[PDB]
Each structure stands twice: as C-alpha cells, then as structure tokens.
C-alpha cells in the first residue's frame, strides 16, 4: 500500500515552451491511436510545402504503450500534455494565447450523436471564453446542432 501510494504521479504534467519564429497548434477531443495516426499521416505528408508547425495534443486520459510508441516515433515534432480543455489552468499550460489554431476531433462512431455535439459545443465555448480571438476548426455530427455555433458571441465565420 505504501509502495502504491508513493509514485502516484502524472508523468505528462508540465507546460509548453514557445519557440520564436515557429507556429504551433493545439489538438483536443477524441484522441485515440487510429485517429492520431491518420491525422499525423495526413498532416505531415511530403506533398505539402515545407512546414515547421508543432502539434500539441491535450487529453485527460494518459496514453497507452503503443500510442506512446507512436509519439516516440514522432519525437521531435509532436508533444503530449495531460489535462482538460475545460480548465483555464490547462489552457494556459498549453500556451493557447499564441496558438495558430485549435482542432477538435469528433467520435463519428458514437452511440448518441447529440451528447458528442453537446460536448464539442462546451469545448468550443470554453476555448472562446479563455481567448476570444483564436481560430477553431471542429467536426459536427448533426446539422441542427451546427446552428448553435452561430450564436456564440465570438464565433466569426468570415474569419477562418
């Protein structure tokens, strides 16, 4: 019991350090092995022009061994931090003030489409509440839920 009580610690706690002359983005939402692999494979393709933006994930569940191995494979251009996007402390930890954009992934194969949309709406509201000028890209499952995003005070579709 003592051995278990000691060593109960978060290995992914910490804060991102900005680099002068280099952008970065924040990815949150439905983080899993297949989704992350597909997203990275499409984002870091060689057909795109030379890019040097960093990808900073943010999830509240510690990754498993093979996801950690994937992050090790993409060691010098991907970072992971444990936290919740509904927490201003975490949002400040991931240096969201200077982030170029925030991407929110969705769970297409979900049991209830409405709950996922509600959670995504909450995440968008939290991010815009913390910083009302960041650019947000999100996935919506149902059309009648997309009209709710049009009523957020800071959601500008003319901007990206």
């Amino acid at each position: 019991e003592i051995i278990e009580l000691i060593g109960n610690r978060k290995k992914y706690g910490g804060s991102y350090s900005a680099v002068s002359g280099r952008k970065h983005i924040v990815v949150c939402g439905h983080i899993t092995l297949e989704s992350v692999s597909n997203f990275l494979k499409d984002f870091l393709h060689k057909d795109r022009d030379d890019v040097n933006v960093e990808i900073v994930f943010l999830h509240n569940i510690s990754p498993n061994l093979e996801l950690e191995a994937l992050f090790k494979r993409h060691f010098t251009q991907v970072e992971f931090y444990q936290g919740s996007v509904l927490n201003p402390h975490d949002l400040a930890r991931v240096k969201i003030e200077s982030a170029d954009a925030c991407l929110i992934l969705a769970n297409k194969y979900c049991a209830d489409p409405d709950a996922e949309d509600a959670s995504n709406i909450m995440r968008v509201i939290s991010i815009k509440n913390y910083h009302p000028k960041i650019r947000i890209i999100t996935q919506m499952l149902q059309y009648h839920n997309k009209a709710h995003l049009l009523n957020i005070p800071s959601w500008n579709w003319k901007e990206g």
Partner: protein, 269 residues
C-alpha cells in the same frame, strides 16, 4: 602514483564535482537572469538537429542508436572481466588492451551525453535524470584513473543501469510496435538491470570492507556468489550458506528487502 596510500577518495570526488558543481551552474544561471529581468535562431536549428540525430529519423541517426545498443553491452562485459581484479590496483594505459578499449567506449558515451543535453527542454530536470546520473558516476573516473596511472573498482556496477534504454531505442528503431511486446521488454530490462546493479553493490561493499573499521571486515566473495545471494534474498528462500557480514552490507540488505521483494513478487508472474 602513490603505492602505499589508498587513492579511492580521488575517484569518488571527481564524480561528485561534476554532478553537484555542474548543478549549481544551472541554478546560478537561472537566478542571475532573474535579477537581470529585475525565422528561427541558429540555436534552435542546432537543437532540432540534435533532436533529429537522437531520434532514429535519419540514416545517420539509425547507426548512432545501434552503436549505443552495442557499446552499452560492451562496457558492461568489461566490468564483468575486471571484477576479479583486486579492489584498488595499479595499471598503465600504454600496455593493456583493457583501459584502452574502455577509453573508446567512454569517449563515445561523453559525446552521446552532449547530444542529449542539447536536445533537452529543461536542463535542470534533464540533469536530474537517471541516465545523466549514471553517466556522471561512470565517465569521469576513467579519465581520472588514466591521469593517476591507478584504478579503483568504484561505482562501476552502475553500468548495468544502461539496460533500461533498450526498450526506448527499440521503439525509436520502429522494431517494437505492440503493447504486449513493449510491456514484456520493459519488465525484463528493469528486472535484470536492477538485479545486476544490486549484486554489484553487494560485491563492492563486501569485498572492500568498512572504512571506519580500517578495512578489516573484508569477506572474500565473487560476483557470481553475490548474484546467487541476491537471487536467494529476492526469492524469500533464504539459506544460511552465504549472507552479508559487514555493517554497510547489512544496512543495504535491510533497505533492499523493502523493495526488491515486492518487485519480484509482482514482475515474475
């Protein structure tokens, strides 16, 4: 140098200077800038090049990591051979394959430590790391011994702590991809490394003696016998054929019984 006098303190002092003395440079630098406050730069390019080299993202990076795997075992094997020599002996650098091959290994481990230092984010928490600590306690004494024309079987048993990096460099090489294999390699590496390290510490303490007893408790033991003793202790079988008889050995055995027993009970099944 001095045949009659014991020179063990020189080797130990070298390692403590680099660790503690180098640590304060980091702390002094942070406070000095604190009072100063009252496109990518060239440093960033060097840092990302060092990170790419450390990872296996290039053909040059792949061969460097493989050499780290090979030389970490080679340095460990050399310790096994040299463990049967007297505790503190005299050897010259110009007429021995050993202490000359070991020079090549330890010079390489110094350069690899430099690359890891550059690629780190927070230098303080990189300094306070297990691999950095084992490098600090392993590398400088070789140069000290070469300068002094002497030798001492000091904290050389720490060379078995380099086996932990295997499970990570295999993932860098894109060899391990599945959770079961990753877990198996992690467990095996940790278990073997800590077992061998504990055996080496017992060997050193028992064969040397007690410093405040003027080295009169020296009990003659071999590395294989110490490995057998640690295995019997971890298994909780506990014959009376071999056991620690010095004060430091008994103290370390008492403190190791707390953790090694639980580790053995959990890992092996």
């Amino acid at each position: 140098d001095s045949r009659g006098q014991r020179m063990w303190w020189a080797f130990l002092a070298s390692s403590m200077v680099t660790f503690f003395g180098g640590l304060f440079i980091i702390l002094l630098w942070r406070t000095l800038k604190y009072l100063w406050t009252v496109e990518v730069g060239w440093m960033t390019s060097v840092k990302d090049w060092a990170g790419v080299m450390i990872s296996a993202q290039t053909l040059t990076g792949r061969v460097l990591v493989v050499l780290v795997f090979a030389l970490s075992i080679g340095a460990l094997v050399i310790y096994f051979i040299d463990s049967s020599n007297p505790i503190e002996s005299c050897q010259n650098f110009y007429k021995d394959f050993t202490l000359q091959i070991d020079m090549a290994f330890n010079v390489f481990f110094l350069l690899y430590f430099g690359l890891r230092f550059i690629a780190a984010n927070d230098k303080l928490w990189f300094w306070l790391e297990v691999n950095s600590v084992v490098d600090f306690f392993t590398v400088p004494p070789v140069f000290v011994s070469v300068y002094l024309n002497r030798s001492w079987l000091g904290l050389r048993f720490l060379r078995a702590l380099r086996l932990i990096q295997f499970s990570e460099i295999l993932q860098f090489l894109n060899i391990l991809k599945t959770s079961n294999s990753i877990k198996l390699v992690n467990l095996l590496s940790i278990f073997i490394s800590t077992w061998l390290t504990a055996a080496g510490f017992i060997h050193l303490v028992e064969n040397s003696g007690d410093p405040w007893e003027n080295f009169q408790n020296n009990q003659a033991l071999t590395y294989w016998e110490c490995v057998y003793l640690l295995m019997v202790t971890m298994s909780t079988v506990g014959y009376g054929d071999v056991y620690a008889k010095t004060t430091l050995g008994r103290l370390f055995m008492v403190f190791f019984i707390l953790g090694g027993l639980a580790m053995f009970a959990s890992y092996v099944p």
